[PDB]
Ligand binder design. Structure first.
Ligand SMILES: CC[C@H]1OC(=O)[C@H](C)[C@@H](O[C@H]2C[C@@](C)(OC)[C@@H](O)[C@H](C)O2)[C@H](C)[C@@H](O[C@@H]2O[C@H](C)C[C@H](N(C)C)[C@H]2O)[C@](C)(O)C[C@@H](C)[C@@H]2N[C@@H](COCCOC)O[C@H]([C@H]2C)[C@]1(C)O
Lengths: 96, 64, 51, 76
RNA sequence: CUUUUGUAUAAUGGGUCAGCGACUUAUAUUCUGUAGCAAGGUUAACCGAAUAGGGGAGCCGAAGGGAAACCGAGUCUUAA
RNA sequence: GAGGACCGAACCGACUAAUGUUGAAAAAUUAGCGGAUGACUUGUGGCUGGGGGUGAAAGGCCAAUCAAACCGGGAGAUAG
RNA sequence: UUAUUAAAAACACAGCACUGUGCAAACACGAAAGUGGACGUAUACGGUGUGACGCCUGCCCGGUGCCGGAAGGUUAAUUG
RNA sequence: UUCCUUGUCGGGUAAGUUCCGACCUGCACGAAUGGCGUAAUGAUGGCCAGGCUGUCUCCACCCGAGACUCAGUGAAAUUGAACUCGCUGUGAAGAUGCAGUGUACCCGCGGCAAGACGGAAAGACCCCGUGAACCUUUACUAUAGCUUGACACUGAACAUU
RNA sequence: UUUAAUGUUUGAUGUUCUAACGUUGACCCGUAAUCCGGGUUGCGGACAGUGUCUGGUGGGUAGUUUGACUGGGGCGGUCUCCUCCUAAAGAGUAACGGAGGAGCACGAAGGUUGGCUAAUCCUGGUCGGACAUCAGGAGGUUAGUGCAAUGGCAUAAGCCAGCUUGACUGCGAGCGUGACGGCGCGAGCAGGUGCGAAAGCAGGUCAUAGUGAUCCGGUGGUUCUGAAUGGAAGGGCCAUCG
């Protein structure tokens, strides 16, 4: 970063933002990961057992990424409106 | 030993999707009465690091 | 180097304000203008206050 | 007393010459005064910058009773 | 030979010979080549008549946007 | 028979000149020179130690070493 | 007196002056104990400047320092 | 101590930027960081005179120790390599080495120092380095020491209020 | 209504006192000892002295700083910005080259609608003059522009009046200019507003100087965050200040 004495780029620009401690305990789950789970019903514990999310994850969200083919019961997870349609299209069920 | 991040650079640059870096504009901390509103408005959104400066940023943020 | 910086506070409840300069030696009277308040999205009257 | 001062060059002058095709908003000429005047489909900025208000080819003409140079955009 | 805009230079260095004498190592990181596997890839410590096998704790990747909550193939900006 | 008295050897010193300057000698020799009962000189032993000593003071001297000794260590200090 | 290019008009000096110091002295060396000053006691001791002797040593207390003053202003910890 | 300056005048000399005496126009003396005198003293500074002389005019001879030759022993600095001339020109701008030209048989010995930008010591001058050291101060920041107060070690009685 | 004086808390001091403490006073013992300790006594005495805290002083000592450009260095000058020339008819272009300016001003000197057109001189005319105001002619911008220069300006960008706050908020096609940080121009869109009958014009001022990154911190706001949870502190975001 030394530029010969001129105020370097990372010092003449302002600092911004802050780091959220909740983002470190939140994960995203692809539709293609719903088949890797064991038992069909997916929750925090079953996703951790399947080594899909970290052990310290407290909040998990399923997004429209990949593709789901089997009926899956999502429980206690936030689901995007795009993934909600794809899960219900494969005979799945979403319950809060 | 691991490379150490320049912590001052980590608080000013965020890595974007295609590998670029976004940053806040300068000239928007203090005296602002004399600055035209059009000028201050164009400084609010984040900007991308120019091509000539990417070498400096990447060297300072090896784990970004 | 005589003009002092002042702020014009909106008469509405919102704390929005503009900032400008003023020569308080020649113009001791308070400055009152109708300016757009982006919080209520209306043109209300703005009165002078200290910066 | 002593000289040695000057100011930075301002890069004035014509940016798009006659016949060039420009997009709407393209700056045609930067100038201090109105050495050139705005014609058809050409605006005059607050610093008398002439910019194209429509796409087409730029055109220089001398018109009027004072033989003033005008810049217009032949919309194409 | 070096150093220089420029050296037969009266600029530097060497009396000669023989031996020795200067871009290495470790760990990270990025890029290129090459090999394996491939939406996956790979294990670390450790266990182990141990270069095998076990060990998937982890790490990287398959999703991003936003300061963030959050939303999510979109998101942020804004009353829009 | 007084004297930091006089002349002058030993003794202590070092003013001038020459020589020497890869010397006989990392400070001398030769010829002259100053003090020579005193704030004199000398032997033996002791004490003061490094930002410290000692200095009738020249930054002098402190083992051929001094505007901060020597030896070992930090140490392969750093050297645009 | 500059050991080893300077011996002098430099340093010292007797004398002079100022100033500090009442003795567990000032002061100095010491984290301290203590020691020197001194087994001394203001006709003494320390510091500073001047430098035998002779004739002398004028004016300025605004600045800086030192000494004295204590009314007032300002002002630390503390207190809350 | 005086820049102007070899000030001016006087003395000394045939001739004196020094010296001595005076003048005052003290660039920029001055009274204990002392002023002005001062006998004696000084390997102290300046100047003059007598004596004396190879200091000199201007060197000559002589006596010794080297130098020189013979025998014995036997160094040193330095050194890219050399078959290592003059001149004029040229050229990193002062040539043994380039150009042109002149001169010159090969090799010693005794001498002399004009050149080899001769030898010696990575210029002490000068500049530079966001080098160093030590020194100074009303540079900055600290700090030993000195000093102020509060609290503690630290109590009683009583006034004064 | 008021006044005095005995009783109390805290101070404000002082004159006594002795019992802490001091004693480098005397005497005794350890002890055949000018150390030290104990004892007796005297004299001081809550002072002195020491610890923690604190103000002052502090080249006694220590660590350091003490710029660059520069026809060598120093000295003097200069260091950012604007205008002209050098600059070779696009842009750009150096010198301790030649000349000048800026570190602001203005709620009108901004917006809009309506109107208006100078300098100078001549002639005539109370005080009145070379120069005041009046009238006419000439003249044609030689004037004016908040300020340097340059480029502009009559449709005036110059001058006057009315009404006003667009010196708006969110944005922004597309360009210009920079190594970059940045800087500049901008039609149009949304919201709301002013002037005008209306077409329209207005996102400051004829344009180009009037300026300072980041950090740290302040103030206001904020359907952001809140280290068990609910809050809060702090942080973020927006506006703004040093
Ligand atoms: C007695 C012999 C010593 O040399 C001398 O004394 C010389 C006279 C000495 O010079 C004297 C006398 C002087 C006048 O130069 C003639 C004076 O300028 C110089 C600085 O000092 C040499 C030339 C003197 O050399 C001159 O140095 C100056 C600085 C530059 C001269 N020249 C390059 C122009 C150069 O000739 C040196 C530096 O003294 C020589 C040096 C190589 C050696 N060191 C010196 C040590 O003593 C002197 C102290 O030094 C710190 O001793 C030297 C060398 C070994 C000798 C040769 O031993």
């Amino acid at each position: 970063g030394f530029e010969g004495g001129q105020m370097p780029l990372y010092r003449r620009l302002p600092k911004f933002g802050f780091t959220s401690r909740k983002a470190a305990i939140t994960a995203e789950i692809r539709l293609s990961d719903l088949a890797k789970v064991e038992g069909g019903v997916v929750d925090l514990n079953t996703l951790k057992a399947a080594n899909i999310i970290g052990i310290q994850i407290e909040f998990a969200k399923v997004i429209l990424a990949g593709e789901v083919t089997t009926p899956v019961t999502v429980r206690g997870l936030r689901v995007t409106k795009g993934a909600r349609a794809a899960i219900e299209a494969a005979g799945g069920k979403i319950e809060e | 030993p691991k490379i150490k991040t320049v912590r001052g650079a980590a608080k000013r640059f965020k890595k974007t999707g295609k590998g670029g870096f976004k940053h806040k504009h300068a000239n928007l901390r203090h005296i602002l009465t004399k600055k035209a509103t059009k000028r201050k408005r164009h400084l609010r959104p984040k900007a991308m690091v120019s091509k000539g400066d990417l070498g400096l940023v990447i060297a300072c943020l090896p784990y970004a | 180097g005589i003009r002092e910086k002042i702020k014009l506070v909106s008469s509405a409840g919102t704390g929005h304000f503009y900032t400008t300069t003023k020569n308080k030696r020649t113009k001791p009277e308070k400055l009152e203008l109708k300016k757009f308040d982006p919080v209520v999205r209306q043109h209300v009257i703005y009165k002078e206050a200290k910066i | 007393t002593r000289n040695g001062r000057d100011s930075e060059a301002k890069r004035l002058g014509v940016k798009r010459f006659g016949g060039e095709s420009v997009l709407a908003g393209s700056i045609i000429v930067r100038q201090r005064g109105t050495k050139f005047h705005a014609g058809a489909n050409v605006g005059c900025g607050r610093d008398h910058t002439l910019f194209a208000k429509a796409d087409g080819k730029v055109k220089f003409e001398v018109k009027g009773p004072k033989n003033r140079k005008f810049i217009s955009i032949e919309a194409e």
